[PDB]
């Protein structure tokens, strides 16, 4: 049975084609003491003796020796398979460098000896999982945010927007403003505690200025969080100020337009004839789109930017942390996908550049 591996800046999502969910989800980290190395959940717990490295940054693989360790860990420790037995669908970021696609292909065939493989674009898989062939995906993870317009099954490369503001930046900012509130979150161990606060307590305000005034004239927007040591801390307007950064990147000294503006800019780089279908099919995917209120806020913000007669629809599936993986699971399972794999034989005859002809 085919394997599906969705490698992210922060998390690896791995499983079997035909399952409704990944079997394994773990941090894309390699830890070394300074046993040579530890990968994933093992590296997290042993951080007292380990220095941690992330092989993927902003969606792009930049450390290929550590990435091989991630993949070995996926095959042997998590999925517990013999790689040589299983066709392997991998995912890539939009606009992933051509040499990266080739390197990925080379490693799979030459290091792991897979019988077949395929590389799919993450945002496109997410659109498929939503039961659409046309739309614009807002994919936001731990390391990167993209706007990816897609028409009749294929991304429009010229109109893709990249934003190097995502979950890790939000976590760092929450650390800063919680520090300002009197607490001390600065170390890497403490980063993960603040990430949990972010995931449990943060939300996107429908109207930001109104929310600030509510938090200033009430305490009903305040929440408590129990630290590991037992200390109960309070979170006030930081709850919505953190993710507001997505809409106002100036909050962290960035000159970039916020996610609503990049969405509009992306749509506007497309043919006027398809924009209507883009506006009606805004699909959110990735962990950083999980904030309560984000879909309603995006609806409001894009409505304000679009022509007043445009039908705007934000689709935010509850399962959208795994949408990319699920799309891959469906794709790999289709009776019509059997001929679409790059086989080991095809790789032997053509070399790594086959990926550019077999995988859009």
């Amino acid at each position: 049975t085919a394997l599906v591996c969705d490698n992210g800046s922060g998390l690896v999502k791995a499983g079997f084609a035909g399952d409704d969910a990944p079997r394994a989800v773990f941090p894309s980290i390699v830890g070394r003491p300074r046993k040579d190395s530890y990968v994933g959940d093992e590296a997290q717990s042993k951080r007292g003796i380990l220095t941690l490295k992330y092989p993927i940054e902003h969606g792009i693989i930049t450390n290929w020796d550590d990435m091989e360790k991630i993949w070995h860990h996926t095959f042997y420790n998590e999925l517990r398979v013999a790689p040589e037995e299983h066709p392997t669908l991998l995912t890539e970021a939009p606009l992933n460098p051509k040499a990266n696609r080739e390197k990925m292909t080379q490693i799979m065939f030459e290091t792991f000896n897979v019988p077949a493989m395929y590389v799919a674009i993450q945002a496109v898989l997410s659109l498929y999982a939503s039961g659409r062939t046309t739309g614009i995906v807002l994919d936001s993870g731990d390391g990167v945010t993209h706007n990816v317009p897609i028409y009749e099954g294929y991304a429009l490369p010229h109109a893709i927007m990249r934003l190097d503001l995502a979950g890790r930046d939000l976590t760092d900012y929450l650390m800063k403003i919680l520090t300002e509130r009197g607490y001390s979150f600065v170390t890497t161990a403490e980063r993960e505690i603040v990430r949990d606060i972010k995931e449990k307590l943060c939300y996107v305000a429908l109207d930001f200025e109104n929310e600030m005034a509510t938090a200033a004239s009430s305490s009903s927007l305040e929440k408590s969080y129990e630290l590991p040591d037992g200390q109960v801390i309070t979170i006030g307007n930081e709850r919505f100020r953190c993710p507001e950064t997505l809409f106002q990147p100036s909050f962290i000294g960035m000159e970039s337009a916020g996610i609503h503006e990049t969405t509009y800019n992306s749509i506007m780089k497309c043919d006027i004839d398809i924009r209507k279908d883009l506006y009606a099919n805004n699909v959110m995917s990735g962990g950083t789109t999980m904030y309560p209120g984000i879909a309603d806020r995006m609806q409001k913000e894009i409505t304000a930017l679009a022509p007043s007669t445009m039908k705007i629809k934000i689709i935010a599936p509850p399962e959208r942390k795994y949408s990319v993986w699920i799309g891959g699971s469906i794709l790999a399972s289709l009776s019509t996908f059997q001929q679409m794999w790059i086989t080991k034989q095809e790789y032997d005859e053509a070399g790594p550049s086959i990926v550019h002809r077999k995988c859009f």
Binding site: L11, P22, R23, D41, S45, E192, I193
Partner: peptide, 11 residues
Amino acid sequence: ETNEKNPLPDK
């Protein structure tokens, strides 16, 4: 059954 293997550090 998905196992998300990402535990938080203790004191």
